[PDB]
Design a binder for these strands. Sequence first.
DNA 1: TACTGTTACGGCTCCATCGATGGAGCCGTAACAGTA
DNA 2: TACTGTTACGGCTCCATCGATGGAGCCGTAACAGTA
Lengths: 635, 635
Amino acid sequence: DYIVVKGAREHNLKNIDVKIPRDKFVVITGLSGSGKSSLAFDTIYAEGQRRYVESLSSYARQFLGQMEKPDVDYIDGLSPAIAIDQKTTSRNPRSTVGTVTEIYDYLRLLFARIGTPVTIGGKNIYEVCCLSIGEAKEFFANLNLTERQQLIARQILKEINARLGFLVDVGLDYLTLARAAGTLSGGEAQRIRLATQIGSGLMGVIYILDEPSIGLHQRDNDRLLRSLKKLRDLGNTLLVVEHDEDTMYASDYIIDLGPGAGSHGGQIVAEGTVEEIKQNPNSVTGEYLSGRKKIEVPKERRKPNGKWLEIIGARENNLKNINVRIPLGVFTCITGVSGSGKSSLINEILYKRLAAELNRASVKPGEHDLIKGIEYLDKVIDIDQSPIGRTPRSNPATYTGVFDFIREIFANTTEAKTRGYKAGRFSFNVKGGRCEACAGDGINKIEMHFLPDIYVPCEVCKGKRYNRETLEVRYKGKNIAEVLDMTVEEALEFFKNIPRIHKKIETLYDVGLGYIKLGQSSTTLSGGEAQRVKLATELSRKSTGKTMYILDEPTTGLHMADVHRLVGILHRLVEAGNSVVVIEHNLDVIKTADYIIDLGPEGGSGGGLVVAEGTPEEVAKVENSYTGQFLKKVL
Amino acid sequence: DYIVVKGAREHNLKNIDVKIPRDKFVVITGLSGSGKSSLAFDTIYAEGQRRYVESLSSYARQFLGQMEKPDVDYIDGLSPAIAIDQKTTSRNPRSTVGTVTEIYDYLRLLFARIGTPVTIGGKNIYEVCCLSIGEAKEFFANLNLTERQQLIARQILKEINARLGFLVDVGLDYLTLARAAGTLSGGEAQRIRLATQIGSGLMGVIYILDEPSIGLHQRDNDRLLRSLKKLRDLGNTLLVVEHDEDTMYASDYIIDLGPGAGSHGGQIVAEGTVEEIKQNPNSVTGEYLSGRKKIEVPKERRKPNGKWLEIIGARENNLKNINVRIPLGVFTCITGVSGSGKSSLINEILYKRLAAELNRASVKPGEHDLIKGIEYLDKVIDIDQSPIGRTPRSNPATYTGVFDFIREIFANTTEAKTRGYKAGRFSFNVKGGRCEACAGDGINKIEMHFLPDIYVPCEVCKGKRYNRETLEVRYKGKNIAEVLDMTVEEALEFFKNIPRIHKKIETLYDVGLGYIKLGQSSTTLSGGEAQRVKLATELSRKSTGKTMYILDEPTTGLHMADVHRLVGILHRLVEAGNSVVVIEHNLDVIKTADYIIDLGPEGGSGGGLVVAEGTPEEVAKVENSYTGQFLKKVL
DNA sequence: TACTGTTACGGCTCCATCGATGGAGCCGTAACAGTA
DNA sequence: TACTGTTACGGCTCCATCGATGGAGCCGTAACAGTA
Ligand SMILES: Nc1ncnc2c1ncn2[C@@H]1O[C@H](COP(=O)(O)OP(=O)(O)NP(=O)(O)O)[C@@H](O)[C@H]1O
Ligand SMILES: Nc1ncnc2c1ncn2[C@@H]1O[C@H](COP(=O)(O)OP(=O)(O)NP(=O)(O)O)[C@@H](O)[C@H]1O
Ligand SMILES: Nc1ncnc2c1ncn2[C@@H]1O[C@H](COP(=O)(O)OP(=O)(O)NP(=O)(O)O)[C@@H](O)[C@H]1O
Ligand SMILES: Nc1ncnc2c1ncn2[C@@H]1O[C@H](COP(=O)(O)OP(=O)(O)NP(=O)(O)O)[C@@H](O)[C@H]1O
Ligand SMILES: [Zn+2]
Ligand SMILES: [Zn+2]
C-alpha cells in the first residue's frame, strides 16, 4: 500500500523520507538538477532490480548485470518494476520499427507456429511487415482461424493486438513495420521507445517514467495521458518524472523536490494534491502553477520591418512543396504536431543553406528551389535536437571551450615559461601532466564480473588528476586543480579582468549554472544541466548584430524557471537586433513569440502544409490548427 | 504479512485457499502424493518466478526461461523466492566441490583482483583449492590485508566467509575444494546442493525447501535445523516440505494436506501448531505423531540360528580394514552418520560379491580379503540409492514389467492371430501400432521460444496413443487403451486368473499404489510414487526361500504410513525365511530391527570403524555412538 | 520345454554446464581562409 | 597581427544488439546360460 523509503542519500539527497502511495498516478516535480532522477531511477528502480536479481544464479546475475547498490537504508513494499531511461537511445540503420517494438519476433513466431506452407490470412510475412500499423491492426483483428489454430495462437495474437492497439492510440497509425527506426523524429522515437516496454500492460507492476513527453505536442500529450490512465486502471502504480502542467493536473499525488538545485537541493518541499501544491508557498513549482510568478507575455508585439526570408518549393521529406515566409528581426516560433515536418523544413533546408552561404560549409541542403533574403544575414548559429555525448573526459569547462583559454593563460605564466611547459601539459587528456597511475581519471574504477563495481580513489595523485610537478605552478595563488575545483560564480569573480574567459563564464552563469563546478564529469551531468550547457556553448559565441539563431527544442529537461530564464535571454538577444527562430512545443515560449508559423494539420504523410501563420492572436482565430485551440485558452 | 493463495487447482488440488504466514518456519506435511510439491513448488515458486521474469526484456525472458503458468486465481504478498528441487541432480566428472558451491568463482575473482604477482597470503590458487574446508576457513579468517586491499575485497571475502561457515556448520569440514562432486554420498551431495543456494543468506526472501533431509542422519538433521533457524532469524520466510518428526516439532506453523493421495487428496485437513495438529483427529500425520497409530516394535527379537556372513579385511574407500558379521535369517539394519562408510561397505563389497558368485554377474567388487558364508544363499536382490529416470515413454506398467505379459496376452487373442499381429504392435514405443501423427505420445507439446509451452491433445488418435486398426481387437471386452486406463485395483480384479500378472499387480497394490493408473507417465510421477514403484519392481521378483534383500534407503519420499507398510512387507518376507539387510536412517525402521551394525563414529576419513553391534537394546547401551543415544529416547 | 538371471544392441529422452562487434560522439592538435 | 568560422586526423569512451554438447537412464529386441 506504500513504497516507504527512509534514509536515502544517493547523489545529492539530504536523507529524505518519502511515502509513495500505490495504485495511483504519482508525479515528482522540481527544478532541474533537484534530484528527481536520483530519487526514482537511481534508488527505487535500482533497489527493486537488485533484490529481484540477487535471488538468481551466478550465470543469470552476470548476464543481466547488477546495478550499483543505492545508498538507502531500507525500502518497503517494493514490487517488480519496469523503467524507461531519460537519456535517448540511438538506433542502428539495420533496425526497423517492428524489431524495436518487438512485434517482429511475435510475427515470426506466429508464422512459424500457425502459418500454413508461411502464409496466414493469404499474406506472407513481407506483406504484413510492409504494411501500415492501422491496416495491420485491422487485418489482425478480423482474422479467421480454426479451433486448433485459435487455441495454439492465443498468447501470440493477444500481445500483437495489444501492442498495435497502443501504437494506434498514441497516434502512429501512419508508420510501416519495415520503416527504419533511426529516421523517426523526436516524438515518434519517444513513442516507439515507450511502446517497446509499456504497450503490453501487466498487473501489480510499478511503472517508472523518466520524462515520457519529449518532443510531443500538447495533443499527443493528452492522448498519452489517457493511455497512461487506462494502463493505471489495470491495477498498477505509475511514477512520472515530468515538467509539464498537464501531467501535474492529471496526477493523484504530487511530490516536490528542491528547494533549489545541485548542493542547494535534494530535499522535499511540499506534498499533496494539486491544490495542496498551489497553496504551499515554499514550492517554486506551486508558485509558478498558481500564477504568482509567470512568464510575461509582451503587451505589444514587434512587427516586421520589411525584411523577410522566403522559402519557395520546400519539398523535403513529407513537405508538399509549400511556400513559407520567415520575418527577420523578430522572435519567430514554429509550432506543429509531432511529425508534421517542421524540423525537416528548417534544420534540413534553411540552416544548411544559410551555413553553406555564410560559413562556407560543405553540407548538402534539402530539396528546395531557392531562398530569398540570405544576403540580409551575416552568420547562422544553431542548436540541434540531437542529444549530447557523455564521456568521463568531458566537463563544462572543456565543453563550452574555456579550458583552452585557461590552459593558455597557465602556460603564459613565468614559471611555466621557465620550465618549458606548453598548454598541453595542463590537460589531463594529454600525457605529460596527467598522473600516469590513474591516467588522469582522478579515481580508479574496479570492475567485477557479476558483483557491482567499486570506485576507489587514486593514491598517487590523491584525486587531483595532476602530478606534483604540474601543480607547483600557480596563477594568482591557485593551481589548475583549484581552478577546476571552483564553481561558476567563483570563476566569474576570478577571471573578471580577462574578457575572453569572462564572456563564456557569464554566458554559463546566465542560464542558471552558478552552482556547477568547472570539473564536474559529463557522465555525472543531469539531463537539464547538459541541455543548459549545450545552450550556453552556442549562446556564448559572438554576434555581429545581424545574425540568425535556430534553436531546435531547447526545453528538453528544463523547468519553468529555466525556460523563463531562456526566454528572457532570447528576448534580450532579439532586442539587440537579431532574428531568432525557435522550433518549440512548450506553450509558454510560443505565447510570447512575435510570429508563429504553423504546420500540419497532422503528422506523417498527412501533414506538411502551412495551416496558420501570423501573430499568436491571429493564429488563435484559426480552428483548423490545434495550436490555435490551445492558444485560445492560453491567451 | 501473508502469502494468501485463493483458488489453486494445479495438478490434483481441489481449489484450496491457504494463508501462509511470513517470517516464520512453516512446514507442509501430508501423505505421499497428497499434493505438497504441487502446492509449493508448482504454484508459489512458479507464480513468483513468472512475475519476476515478465518484467524483463525478451532476451532475458528467453534466456532465463519462463515456467508454466500455474492454475491459480491470484497470489498476494509474494516476494523473490529461491527454491531447491526435490529431484536429485547428477554431476559431471569434471565438476568439483568448489565449482558446484560457486566458491571457485569467488576465489578466482579474489586472486585476479587482489593477488600480488596470483599469490595472496603466501599461497597460490592450487594450494587453496587442494585444502580442507575447515583449514581454508581458518586461513581466510586470519588474513592480513592492507587498507586498499581490504577496501577492494570486501564483498568478495564476506561471501567466501559465509559459505565456508555454512559448510563447516553443516559438518563438511573434511572435504577438499578439489574433490570431485560426483563421488560424494547421498547426504554429502544433499548438503552441497543446499550450500550452493542457501549458504549466503539474503533479507526478505522466501526460501522453499523440497525435502532437504535426504540421506541425513538425525545428528546432521539437528545441525541443519539449527542452521535453518539461524537463517530464518535474518528476517526471511521458510517453507519446508518434509516428512520427519524433528522438522514438525521445530516449526512454528504446520499445514497438513490430504486426506489421502492421488485423486483422493489435494485438500487441506488441519492447520495450526504441533499441539493443534495432534489434537485434530482428521489428520493422519497428527494421529501418527500423537501415538494413536504407530509402528509396532516387536516384543521378542529373533536370534541368529548359527548362520553368519563374515566380511574380513573390508578396506573400501574410507574403511579401516574392519571385520563385520551379518547374521542370516533375521532382519538386519545398518546405521551410521552420513559419510561413515556403510554404503561403501555393503553396496560396494557384499552385494557385488554376492551377485558375482550367484547371478554370474561381471561386476568388479570392492577391496576386501574374502567373504565367508556365501554358500548359504541362493540369489541376491537389491535396491540402489540412485534415483530413477523419468521419461514420457515410461509408466508403472512398463516399469514393473507387466507390460510385456499384457502385450503377449493381447497378441495371443484369436483376432490378433488372424490379423498377423505380434506383441510389438501393441506398444506405443514401436512403429506399427502407434499413431504416427503424435508418435504414440498421445498429446502434442507445442514449444515456444520465450513464452510458456502449450499442450494440445492429438486429434487423429483422440489421445488414446493407438490407431483404429489396433484398438479393434479386444480381450475380455477391453482393448489396450482401456487396459492402460484403469487403476491398479481394477487391474487386480481384471487379471485375477492370470498368476504371472497377478503377482506383480499384487506387489504394486501392497506398497499402497491402488489408485495409480497403469499408463501414468513417469515424468508426471511423484517422488514418493516413483520410489514405491522402484521398490515394488524389485519386491515382485520370485524368492526361493533362501535369498538376501539389500535395500539402500527406501524411505526417500515416504510418509509414516508408507514406511509402516514397507516395514510390514519386510517383516513378512523375513518371517517367510529370508534375510534382509537395510541401510536406513529412519528411526522407526531401525527400532524394529532384530540386529544393528553401527559404523562411525564420524564421517569422512574420521569414520569407517564399527562402534556398536548387536540388538537395539544392546546398541542403546553404548555411549560412543549417537545412534545409541537416540535409541535411548526411542526405546 | 518353461521360468528366470545375466549380457549386448539400437533408439529415444532428460538434465548438467558453460560478451563481442559495429556505430556515434568528444577532446586535443593542426591547417586554411575570411574579417577587423 | 589577432579573432573566429570551417575542415581534417588521431585517440578514447559509451551504447545498441543479438542455446549447444556431453553424460546418464529407460524401453524394446535378441541371445546365452542355469534350474525346474
Ligand atoms: N554521479 C554523480 N556524482 C555526483 N553528483 C551527481 C552525479 N549524478 C548526478 N549528480 C548531481 O546530482 C544532482 C541531481 O541529479 P539528478 O537527480 O540527475 O537531477 P534531476 O533532478 O533529475 N534533473 P533533470 O533530469 O534535469 O530534471 C545534480 O546536481 C547532478 O549534477
Ligand atoms: N529520412 C527520412 N526519410 C523519410 N521520412 C522521414 C525521414 N525523416 C523524417 N521523416 C518523416 O517526416 C515526417 C516529419 O519528420 P520531422 O520533420 O523530423 O518531424 P518533427 O516535426 O521535428 N517532429 P518532432 O521532433 O516530434 O517535433 C515524419 O513523418 C517522419 O517520420
Ligand atoms: N504432470 C502431472 N499431471 C497429472 N498428475 C500429476 C502430474 N504431476 C503429478 N501428478 C499427480 O499429482 C499428485 C500430487 O503430486 P505431487 O504434488 O508431486 O505430490 P507430493 O505430495 O509432493 N508427493 P511426495 O513428493 O512423494 O511427497 C500425485 O497423485 C501425482 O501423481
Ligand atoms: N569414489 C570415492 N572415492 C573416494 N572417497 C569416496 C568415494 N565414494 C565415497 N567416498 C567417501 O567415502 C565416505 C563414505 O561414503 P559412503 O559410504 O558412500 O557414504 P554413506 O555412508 O552411504 N552416507 P549416506 O549416503 O549419506 O548415508 C565419504 O567420506 C565419501 O566422501
Ligand atoms: Zn593518480
Ligand atoms: Zn495421434
